[PDB]
Amino acid sequence: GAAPAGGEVRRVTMYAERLAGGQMGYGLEKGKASIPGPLIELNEGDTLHVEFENTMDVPVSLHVHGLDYEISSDGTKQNKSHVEPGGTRTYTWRTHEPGRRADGTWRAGSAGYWHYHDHVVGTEHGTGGIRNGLYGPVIVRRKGDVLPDATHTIVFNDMTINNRPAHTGPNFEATVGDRVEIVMITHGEYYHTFHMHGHRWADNRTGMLTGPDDPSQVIDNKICGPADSFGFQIIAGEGVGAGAWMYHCHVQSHSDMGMVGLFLVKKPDGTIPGY
C-alpha cells in the first residue's frame, strides 16, 4: 500500500478526560481516553476539524506541531484559544503538498511525524498537562509514501515511557517480515537517546533511504529532547530473525531505572526463540 493524494475535509471529535491517579488523557470518545492519545493520520492536502470538548474541571488546550493552523487554533491561553471546563471548541488543522513558490524556491510540505499536546494545564506552557498524559501522535503522509502493517507510538515523557510505571514496557508484537512503523516523541525536562536492538533506520523524513543517492546517516541510536519527534519503518527481524528485541533509552541511569521495552518478533508459527 501507498498513500493517496489528499484533499479531503475530515471531522473528528476529541475529549480531554481525567484518568486514574491524577492523570489526564485525550480520547476520540468520552470514556475512551488513552496515554498516548489516539493516532491522527492525514494525507498532505487534508483538512481536519477537531470538535474538542473539555470534560475536566480545569482549563485545557490542544496545540499541534507541524501542521498549518490559524492563530485562533494555536491552542494557548495567550491567544485565548484554550477551552474552559465543560466547553467545546473546534480546532482546524490544515496540510499542504510541497511545491515551487512564485519566488522560485521549494515550499516544504506538511508530511512528517508530528504530535499534539496540551499547552495550559499547570502552566501556560502545559507542563502539568504533558506530565499528566495529554499528548498524542500525528502522522502526515505524502502521496506515494509506503504504508505500514502496524504503527506503534513510543513517548519518552520525563523518566517514563507513555507514563507507564518503570519496568512495565510497553511491549509491541510483530511477525518476522512485518513492516512496522515507530513514532518517537519526547516530552518534559530531559534529553534521551532512543536505541533499538537488532534494527536500524535512516535519519531522514521517512526513516527509509530514498535510494542509492540518499547520503543520510543510517543509525540505531538518536538523541532527542522535549517536543522532538521522528519516525521510521523497519522490516521486523530483517537479516536478524525472531527474538525478544529490546528497545530502550541508552542514558545509563535511564535504562537501569526501567526506560526499557520489548519488540517481540515472532516466527511465522508464533514462537519466539529464547524468551
Q: Does 247 contact Cl ion by CB under 5 A?
A: no
Q: Does 82 contact its own copies by CB under 8 A?
A: no
- Select the residue interacting with Cu ion from 254, 258, 262, 265 (CB under 5 A): 254
Q: How big is the site for Cl ion, counted in residues (CB under 5 A)?
A: 4
Phi and psi at residue 16, in whole multiples of 5°?
-100, 130
Q: How is the beta sheet containing 179-187 ordered, strand by strand?
A: 160-161, 150-157, 179-187, 229-235
Residues numbered 13-72 forming contacts with its own copies, rule: CB under 8 A: 65-66, 68-72
User: Minimum CB separation from Cl ion for residue 163, in Å?
Assistant: 17
Q: Does 149 contact Cl ion by CB under 5 A?
A: no
Q: How big is the site for its own copies, counted in residues (CB under 8 A)?
A: 94
- Select the residue interacting with its own copies from 59, 219, 264, 267 (CB under 8 A): 219
Q: Which does 123 bind (CB under 5 to 8 A by kind): Cu ion, Cl ion, its own copies, none?
A: its own copies
User: Minimum CB separation from Cl ion for residue 208, in Å?
Assistant: 5
Q: Closer to its own copies at the Cβ: 13 or 255?
A: 255
* Listed residue (199, 68, 60) closest to 135, CA to CA: 60
User: According to the annotation, is 192 in a ligand binding site?
Assistant: yes
Q: Closer to Cu ion at the Cβ: 152 or 254?
A: 254
User: Minimum CB separation from Cl ion for residue 153, in Å?
Assistant: 11
User: Minimum CB separation from Cu ion for residue 121, in Å?
Assistant: 13
Q: Closer to Na ion at the Cβ: 165 or 215?
A: 215
Annotated binding residues, written as ranges, equal 63, 65, 117, 119, 192, 195, 197, 248-250, 254
